[PDB]
């Protein structure tokens, strides 16, 4: 079991971000449930 805090970086339009390990997260860093962040972008199912 590996826990690893990493740098993440995102470019405009900020619909996805990368991790320092080279892994893409196909998701806005600002995605959420409040203040309209639920409309930004997610490639994943809700349960994830």
């Amino acid at each position: 079991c590996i826990v690893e805090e990493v740098d993440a970086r995102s470019v405009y339009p900020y619909d996805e971000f990368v991790l320092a390990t080279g892994d893409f997260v196909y998701m806005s860093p600002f995605y959420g449930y409040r203040e309209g962040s639920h409309t930004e972008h997610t490639s994943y199912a809700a349960d994830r």
Binding site: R9, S10, V11, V18, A20
Partner: protein
């Protein structure tokens, strides 16, 4: 009696011409983006 030249009003036959030198100017280094900024604008760095 004698008198000084300053006692007589002075009219000038000279034509005035006022030339001033162009002063020194210092040019500082100035870039819109440094190399560090250009390299950092990439989302993933393959080397890192």
């Amino acid at each position: 009696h004698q008198l000084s030249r300053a006692d007589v009003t002075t009219v000038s036959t000279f034509i005035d011409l006022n030339i001033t030198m162009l002063e020194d100017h210092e040019f500082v280094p100035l870039e819109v983006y440094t190399r560090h900024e250009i390299k950092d604008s990439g989302l993933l760095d393959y080397t890192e």
